[model samples]
Target: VRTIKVFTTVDNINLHTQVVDMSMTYGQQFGPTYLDGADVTKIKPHNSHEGKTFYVLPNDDTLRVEAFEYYHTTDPSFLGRYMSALNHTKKWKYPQVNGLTSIKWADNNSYLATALLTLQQIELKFNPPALQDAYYRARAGEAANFCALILAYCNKTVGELGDVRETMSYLFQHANLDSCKRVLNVVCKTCGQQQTTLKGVEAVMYMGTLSYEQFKKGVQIPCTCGKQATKYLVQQESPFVMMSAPPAQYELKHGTFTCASEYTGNYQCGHYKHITSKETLYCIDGALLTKSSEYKGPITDVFYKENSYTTTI
Candidate 1:
């Protein structure tokens, strides 16, 4: 979701303050797609076996997809030899729920019939590239709306560098563009103080713009010691983008920890200014408390040292 473009300044650094470009495309590697202006009409095959079978999507320049694999190429000649090796370069087969269906033509590129009985009988005209395009289109539009509605409610337009942004279309036609912001971990070089500044990292048209190196070089910010500081790109720092996630449960696979020892029944706790530090860890065959082996302690406890799966020796 961190599809980095400018427009920083988000809410709850712990939350999804910035919401836009959250499109996660999976499986289909060579990804491009056309809007489905028309659903598929009649089709036939088998002669398409010697050649490859492909269908054209209806938008921009058409998307020439080889039956089902998403070798969505424009060149038919390209899909000849090497492409044939993959599932014979045809389409539609399930390892479990369905089986393979290969179709091709006669010597004259004539119509060859396709037949399949088991796989839900939708007749196998699933336009994937078109479908996936919509998948992201809809998701991205919602993401655009999600971000716009947030700041718009507070009477501000969403833009990079605190600049004003245009309104989003209710239909989400161009909602996918420049929809996300990023956070840079600004560390003051002098005092070694760590600070966070969220802003758009990329330049967008009709708005402010800067190169990645541009922002990296010229960031001047303030430090807690009440002095001005300069920011440098760690280079190692990854751009921060989109949404929040629930707390993680790293099932402590190999470690030891203290047990509540119910029989002894004398358990106690201490307080701190931040109890968010209160954590729990689940260990397996985990040793009892009081460290020597793992001198600093078996495992640096997370949350409360005891996790539901913890069974200490």
Candidate 2:
């Protein structure tokens, strides 16, 4: 990918102390989980016929994936192709638990469908140029949310970033946005419920470009379920918006019309009706503060992750 240009804060070294602290803490607490969940493990053993041993999960207890095979790589396209081959071979026929359907297979299919849907939404939201720009925009941004996703699970080394991102961009641009929204949203909603049960922390991590490094460094741990490993295949970061910093809290606190520096705009334009809660807004500002209700903390039970069959060859 060609490098992306971005606006920067030249003299300002982060005015909000609490926001900086929160970002750093977020990195510390949820990093390891990202690595474990995103890192691709090697392909396990496979079946004898031009077939391979593909386990939907890391450790299969029943029938050892019944009819399994091995693939050499971890890319989503490879996995999906392998899965299609497995389906063609009727691998789901074995270890037949009377009432048990292949929820894992169904889940994966659902994810692919959703990916198509998201691409469409992106198409509808922006004109072709803007949509195309977002498509090309690397996941790198203020918090490096997209970059984290690209590295952690996409398995793209620096050299392969172009191909992987291009593939994702195509997937986004060509699919039905509404369908993508419905399917992905369902996947996320269901997975979120499961994440609530994750061990160690009550808050689940949100998918971002920055969380992966934290995980590899042992700052976090993998989900016990292991489905999180496939997280990046299905999600993309939103486009960026610019915002201006208001004066210090003292100036913004009072509904002042003008200030010491002769700025004429009403300071009250930046204020919000405070929601009465223990959740106090500190020196932090911007989306991280105003959007606290949908804060992404850690990945506990994300549907996008749960839908990924980690051990599949």
Candidate 3:
């Protein structure tokens, strides 16, 4: 059977505190089930080796997981929603929280459960279970650093932040090597390394946290070792994809045009340009704006990938 276990705790100084633990299990080739909350008969509260009272419950929730090997996020607001949605395996249903929230879960036992625990429910909160409470305690300031990185990358607001958090979780849970390596490549490139790829990213241990400067100077992520690489560019159609790089500091005035990269077929003038970097161009002013084929494709489909390199450099 394939199973995923989730642990959650809610604390309010003015309200009664409670701890909830649930296991989501499924057959090897079947549907999933959400087991009820903790078992009071087997649950026991006792002092731990660290002197803090540990709420020992049957299936006492996992206690340890290697931070780097497993995947999870550190946003408490997002984490709460994620925990609540996990009927067995895993949304946004709650408002952003000002207090602590933690989410821990594992699948198939291939990777250890991201067992995170805190001394009390009132301290600083984090999610992405893989980097457990212990790791945060040791690193001290990295949790906030990581959270800032995600918020910035995701546009720093609640809705967008939640979107990126989910994307990161999806990649961690499904595209392990590829997506993680993709992230590492961006980090290494920003670290001033010239040759960074999935293989290179995997060559070393990574914990997914980096400073703002490092994340800003992200490097190019290649496709595979051999075949032609793919590159994603803007277009003059509805279903277009934009690069996730930082947006321009100021908005571009209408009719402004500049040389885009070589991803598009350059004309006598140069590459296609719209308002800013990776900006999509459609027939908005009732006239043809861009002459480059990269921005001239017919409107058909649109989606996002971990790496924006979908067509070649």
Q: Which candidate leads in lDDT?
A: 3
- For each candidate in the order shown, give its overall lDDT on alpha carbons: 0.23, 0.22, 0.24
Q: Per model, state how many residue pairs clash.
A: 18, 33, 9
Give the alpha carbon lDDT tens digit for every residue of 116-227 in model 2.
2222222223222312343344211111222223222333332221221233443333223322211111112224422112211111123332222222222222444543
List, residue by residue over 1-313, the lDDT tens digit for candidate 3: 3222222222111121233222321211111111221223233322221122212111222311221123343232432232222323221111111121222212211011111111111122234433343345324422322332233223333222122223333322322232233323211322332333443223212222211222224323454443333222211111111122211222222223221111123222212111212334222111123322234221111112223322222
lDDT of 1 by residue, 47-107 (tens): 2222222222222232222232332234333222122222221232212111222123211
A best-first ranking of the candidates according to their lDDT comes to 3, 1, 2
lDDT of 3 at 276: 19
Cα RMSD (Å) per model?
Answer: 24.2, 27.6, 19.6
TM-score quality measure for candidate 2: 0.16
Score every model by TM-score.
0.19, 0.16, 0.21
Q: How high is the lDDT of residue 107 in model 2?
A: 15
